[PDB]
Amino acid sequence: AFFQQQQLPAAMADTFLEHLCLLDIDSEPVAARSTSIIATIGPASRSVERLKEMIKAGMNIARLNFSHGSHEYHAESIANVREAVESFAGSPLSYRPVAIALDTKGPGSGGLSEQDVRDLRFGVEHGVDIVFASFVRKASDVAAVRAALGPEGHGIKIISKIENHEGVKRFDEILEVSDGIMVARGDLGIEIPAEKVFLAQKMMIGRCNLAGKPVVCATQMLESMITKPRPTRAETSDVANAVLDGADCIMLSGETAKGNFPVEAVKMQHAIAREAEAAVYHRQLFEELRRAAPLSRDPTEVTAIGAVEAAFKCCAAAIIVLTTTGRSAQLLSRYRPRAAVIAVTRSAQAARQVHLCRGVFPLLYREPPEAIWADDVDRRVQFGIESGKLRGFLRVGDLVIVVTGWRPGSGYTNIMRVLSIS
Amino acid sequence: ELGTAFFQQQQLPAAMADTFLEHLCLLDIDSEPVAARSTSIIATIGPASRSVERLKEMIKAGMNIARLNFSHGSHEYHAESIANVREAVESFAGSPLSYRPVAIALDTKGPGPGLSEQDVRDLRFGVEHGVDIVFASFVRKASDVAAVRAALGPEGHGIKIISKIENHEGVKRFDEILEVSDGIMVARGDLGIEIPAEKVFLAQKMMIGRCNLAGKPVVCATQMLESMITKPRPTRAETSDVANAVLDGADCIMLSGETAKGNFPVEAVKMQHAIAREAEAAVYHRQLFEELRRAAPLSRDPTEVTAIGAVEAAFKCCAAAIIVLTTTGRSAQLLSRYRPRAAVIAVTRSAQAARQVHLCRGVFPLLYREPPEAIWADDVDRRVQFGIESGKLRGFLRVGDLVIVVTGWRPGSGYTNIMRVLSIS
Amino acid sequence: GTAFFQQQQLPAAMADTFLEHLCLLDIDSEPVAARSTSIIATIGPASRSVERLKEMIKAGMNIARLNFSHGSHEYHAESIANVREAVESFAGSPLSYRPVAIALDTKGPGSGPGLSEQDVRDLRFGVEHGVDIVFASFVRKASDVAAVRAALGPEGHGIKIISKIENHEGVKRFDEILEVSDGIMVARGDLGIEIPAEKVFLAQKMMIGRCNLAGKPVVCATQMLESMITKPRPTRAETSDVANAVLDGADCIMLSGETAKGNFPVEAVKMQHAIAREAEAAVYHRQLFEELRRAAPLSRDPTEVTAIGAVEAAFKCCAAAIIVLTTTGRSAQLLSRYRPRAAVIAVTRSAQAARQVHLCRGVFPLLYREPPEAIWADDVDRRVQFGIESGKLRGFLRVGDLVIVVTGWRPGSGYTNIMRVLSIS
Amino acid sequence: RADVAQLTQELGTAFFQQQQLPAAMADTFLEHLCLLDIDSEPVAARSTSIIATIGPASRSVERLKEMIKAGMNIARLNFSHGSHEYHAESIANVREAVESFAGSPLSYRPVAIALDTKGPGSGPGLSEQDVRDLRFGVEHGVDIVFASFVRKASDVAAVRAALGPEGHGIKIISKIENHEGVKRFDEILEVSDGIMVARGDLGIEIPAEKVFLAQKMMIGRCNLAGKPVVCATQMLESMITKPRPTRAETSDVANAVLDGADCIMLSGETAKGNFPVEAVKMQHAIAREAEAAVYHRQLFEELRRAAPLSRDPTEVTAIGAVEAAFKCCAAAIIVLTTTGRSAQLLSRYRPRAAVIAVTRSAQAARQVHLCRGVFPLLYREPPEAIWADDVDRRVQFGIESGKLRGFLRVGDLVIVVTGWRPGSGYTNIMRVLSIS
């Protein structure tokens, strides 16, 4: 029964063609949904009660579109998101962090606009986790956004939105200085021929997967759901194909910001992503990611590939990793393990930000500290296990891979352990 | 010999990649498609696309197959649609560069436990009006196909039956249905109501893969460019859906309300044409050919053996085309199953085979009407040169190009056993 | 039948990985195909008798090597005459006649920088006596090959030059030497004295790989069955060395003292024949063909394009043979470079090309002696039938087998362009 | 180039020219062959063990010290000839030569002692002489038995029973020497610790032209099973009288290593020949060249793909450690082992990194020479009070011994494999350490 679920006959196929032939509509997904959902906040999704339903439906990142609304409007949206998120903090083993992303208005006819400088400063003052920078055309646009965030916004992730021909042509220099990329298909489909957008999307997703940096697929994914309760056949296919392409995140804009079915749109993206993740051909994907990733002398990078290889060898239910900044979890995520990456962290911001990386399930550690560091590490690992049991990730008898470091502080991950549950 | 400009077009840097991941990383929006569009477009005929003048514009835009939806309209209404399609197609007989065959497909209303009384009458109408294809609605098992085959009376055994898979039972009994069908249609409209909407992509990808493995045509259908019923431009999900159906391996793509009742029927056909051309150049032939080759069983059938040899030869020299002589379309279908990058130019004397081969990806039919030569080898040579000269006229070929030519050792269908490498003079 | 798929290591051939291929090798799986790696036997006092030479031809000797490091011109002229008398004693039965090439192995430069005066005289002797091949000793650079070619003069343009790589400089300048040579000999005797003995296997494997990539013949030579100079059976290391030279990709294997001066010349030829047949069935064609195909560059030469198409067609139908008509041997060499499992039966009127194609693995030359038919198409068909009738008599073919036939569109060398699937009747 | 560019700038172009690294980075086996270079020098320690047969040419203590220095890892006693008194003296001379280097625990070289049985002869099973010779082996503490003419699983059970309760730790390597042994290979390997391709008798029992098929098949199946396989007989035969081997002999040694053999053997070459030390030196030189020419890219991929999924933590840690070692070009994998099993499971994936096995068992240190790429270090210190400190001391002993021996350099990365509790069977940890 285990080998009939989660498209396991298709996963064991020797060729991609045979993998397709073995896909089964009766093979139910069992793993937790790994592709994060970004929902745009607006009039249809601003109330605290509506936001609680969206969190339950699967929203991981709340997007605030600074192209519309005042600073007062966006501050109220942030407060409502935080109130809805903290309403579930009473059960720390099931609490779900939700990131807050600021999407800039853009340069317009201009580099960095004066309104963007003010909006970026608002973001730093209100503690946003991510910036989706509109119309990034070159590396200096990213440096300008970074400078506008100042010293107090050093930890904010900058996701560059590629929306025109120049952004596509200068992609390599933009990705090098960005934390990740958004394939902003709305403007891209107006700036370049509509029939070429899929090429730009597939290329950028492939390059981001190669670089190990998050990539978001955005705009008109479930467009018809703005007025209709069910999406079109092209819309469900688009969501599934963005996941199969290798996108870390999928997004909803008008579907959640102004549409009549914001919760249903989140539920639909969740349902499709789960089905598409099980249909991923890990046999070739892992082989290619492994082969393309360069040789490294960084112990976090070396431990990460060793841990993902170990996870596939034993069909590990999860890889539990301790992380301060999210980096050790990101390096595991880049190899696309089938095992869920359960990231235990004390940083509330890192817990929100790792939603950008596919297959990373953040757990915010709020248990009392231990006097001996080795005991404190072990307790964080046991917390990962208990949260995993409660959420359905783990059961007694499962094998897990545990990734830790040799001393406190970020940058010292160097250990991988094979543990039997209970 | 060919130049650096040649190797920058049609996604050739992405085509030469050693891994699928590197192939994706090398896809270039500035690399323009050069090859003729190989995925056929099926357009549904209705009030928005019925007039002879509108049909001429749809043929020019790229429509290869006209679909008549027998769920609506009388026999008199459909007979007039057939006459208007034939009048629009024959209006281009004066120009060899613009004349192109267009198949006529009858889509049945559907079942009741099996074949309905209306379907028996509509299938009889199809035989009497010389339709080329039947898109059989709600096929659930092999006996449904046998009932459609029996209803095609004594005169319609040459009509192709494309089984529409629209429910859970059709998906589960897919192998037995494909075995007795000429091809399959992934009818996503009803499929998305009969099974959970989030599972349709799995059924589509599975059925396309199995049809590619069997070497039988597969159609992707319904809501591909839905928003174009009222809007002049499609959504980002719609262009992605069309491109991904081609990348999945679909032989044909379809338009329903977009061309039958919408405000932009011609623009919807133009959009499918533009996307299909871009997506065909983005196909990773290096792995696709290797897997089709490895999965296809060993064969002692000379047509099957010649076809793989010809496709291998075409890839070796970057052949501009594979010219094949075919009476039933079968030799062209066996070339098409290996997905060559070279266009398969099929020269035939059968008007029906010329229309029907539009079901097979990459097959460009040429109807030959010259009087037969007394010496059979001379008649073969005349047809081969007719393919070469039509290719030069349409932009497929130029002097100095290499072409692969597929023929048999004697007249009559079933004897394909020869592959030749020719330099165009 | 199941019995067919148990022989010639077919379970090991169908394996998905090289490791599983090794695990499936079976000592009870008997070889069925004809031995494809040519045997070169050095002529000397143990192998000069016309009667002894007839036994060596029957045992499998394909090329007779004359070592010009020993003996006078009178001694070598007598060896040539005895070889030709033994070879022509079988010419009365043209369907079974086996051509045998004559190769002249030069003394070398000695302490000199280039072509020695003795080599100039020996090369002129070779041209005057009609030798087919020259094994040029101690080739260190491209200009050494040009000097050998100039010493052969205008009458020796058809002689094949196989460069012997015997020292560090020859290994380092391998690419420039191979470019101007017809092929290479890994002359392990001197190589194992010029470079550390423990590094010879690296030079052998590298040169064989580069010759296979270039599609040019490579010979593995020296001490392959050394102990058989005095003992009736070879050592375990010797049988392993012969098998591994075949698995490495060598076109030819050689015997020196084993046939020139030893007590078991015929048994040494029989031993190389037996090992080579076993090792050829153990070749993992699944990966080898894929890699040769992928590494071979794109080509606009129709002979090259027809050759890959024919080898692909042969693997698709498990063809017993590829019958090719050839004037110079080139069309057979281009088929041989893809290492088909099917025997390449090369039918030629050139007695010299029939002898020289033994340098290419898997090429079985048939010398056609009939004068040309008045109708060229009939002359082509008669030669193909001669290939089939010889193939039946020799055990290559049976009624019911499929064969690939490779021909050209006009008389004369350089116009091969046709591949055809034929059933043996 | 992008997959090695950062490491090329850091380690240098000279690093990537040695140990056949251009051939190792090739995308196909054909390109790997084309890139093999006679000027690319081997850098790694020799991983394929050398078994030398002891006889009149190699019996003296002084000659044995030279053979240990030349690279002999296993001493073979052929019980087809000589009395029990003769073999006991050979064992004592081997032990005296081995213990002459014990003064420096950081360098000492353990040498295994293997007893090769006379065989069944015309009998159907275990002979009476074999029962007595096997009891002699247990009494004299031999590490391995090379069991002659194994034809079925019951033959190895008979050898195991003849070793008694005191010989439970002795490794049984079954010699496959006839058609029945080849046909019943799977049942024999299942109950054996390893296999010897005994080509001498095999080449007489089956056609000589088929021996290479049996050798390649048995090596492949042993590699798949993760059990040691020995290639034996006439590898350097001409060196019995000549100082240099033939071209076929060097090729045979190189191809046995490329086939996947864990051990290579010398019989008359060391037992009675005029050049026993030179024969060991020649096998050492060829094995190092051939090990660098192994195409690890496909070999590791195929071993990984063919090995079934496992829930054994030692097996899971081993694959993770070998993958980590390839990712960083690790100089070594240091493993703590009681029985040798954790080192054997690392060895089955054929890492390029040396497997330095730290053990307190003198017998396990001798026996791990059967596994390719395992370098045994015998730890003699008494246990620390805190188990975690004792584990750390053993890891540091491996690192310090490794640096002092040129296996590790400052700046190198090493992978360290340990367990969560004392005793055999609990290996479950992999660590990445930087050498300072």
Ligand SMILES: Nc1cccc(S(=O)(=O)N2CCN(S(=O)(=O)c3cc(O)c(O)cc3-c3ccc(O)c(O)c3)CC2)c1
């Ligand atoms: N991102 C991503 C990165 C790496 C690997 C992978 S992989 O393992 O999943 N897969 C590789 C094979 N390719 S393919 O193009 O060689 C193809 C081959 C067929 O034999 C066929 O029949 C259809 C296809 C095909 C092509 C494009 C598609 O989008 C598609 O759905 C199928 C598909 C992706 C994904």
Ligand SMILES: Nc1cccc(S(=O)(=O)N2CCN(S(=O)(=O)c3cc(O)c(O)cc3-c3ccc(O)c(O)c3)CC2)c1
């Ligand atoms: N000529 C030639 C050219 C192309 C292909 C071929 S091929 O198909 O026959 N070949 C496949 C690759 N392997 S391998 O090297 O990846 C290897 C893998 C194993 O799984 C194993 O068990 C041992 C080996 C092995 C064997 C020989 C070597 O030199 C070596 O380095 C490793 C070699 C054989 C031959």
Ligand SMILES: O=P(O)(O)OC[C@H]1O[C@](O)(COP(=O)(O)O)[C@@H](O)[C@@H]1O
């Ligand atoms: O992923 P990051 O940011 O590098 O953090 C990983 C770090 O977490 C740890 O496992 C635990 O560190 P702390 O005890 O400081 O939380 C370290 O050993 C390791 O260096």
Ligand SMILES: O=P(O)(O)OC[C@H]1O[C@](O)(COP(=O)(O)O)[C@@H](O)[C@@H]1O
């Ligand atoms: O694809 P099909 O229907 O089998 O037709 C292929 C046939 O066409 C030919 O090439 C030409 O035949 P005709 O002259 O009868 O048209 C035959 O030799 C071959 O058998």
Ligand SMILES: O=P(O)(O)OC[C@H]1O[C@](O)(COP(=O)(O)O)[C@@H](O)[C@@H]1O
């Ligand atoms: O292999 P080569 O030397 O190019 O010879 C192949 C030639 O043999 C033929 O098949 C027959 O030619 P001939 O009739 O002159 O012998 C030609 O059509 C072809 O060009």
Ligand SMILES: O=P(O)(O)OC[C@H]1O[C@](O)(COP(=O)(O)O)[C@@H](O)[C@@H]1O
């Ligand atoms: O390789 P083996 O025989 O399983 O031994 C590995 C064992 O060695 C250790 O690393 C150390 O154990 P000891 O302290 O008993 O020597 C254990 O944790 C582990 O189980």
Ligand SMILES: O=C([O-])C(=O)[O-]
């Ligand atoms: O800004 C965006 O998100 C877009 O244009 O798609």
Ligand SMILES: O=C([O-])C(=O)[O-]
């Ligand atoms: O009938 C159809 O085309 C459908 O249901 O998609």
Ligand SMILES: O=C([O-])C(=O)[O-]
């Ligand atoms: O000349 C030769 O053949 C040699 O040196 O091996």
Ligand SMILES: O=C([O-])C(=O)[O-]
């Ligand atoms: O017994 C042996 O060692 C042999 O036969 O090779």
Ligand SMILES: [K+]
């Ligand atoms: K915005």
Ligand SMILES: [K+]
């Ligand atoms: K209908």
Ligand SMILES: [K+]
């Ligand atoms: K000579």
Ligand SMILES: [K+]
């Ligand atoms: K013995």
Ligand SMILES: [Mg+2]
């Ligand atoms: Mg935008």
Ligand SMILES: [Mg+2]
């Ligand atoms: Mg329907």
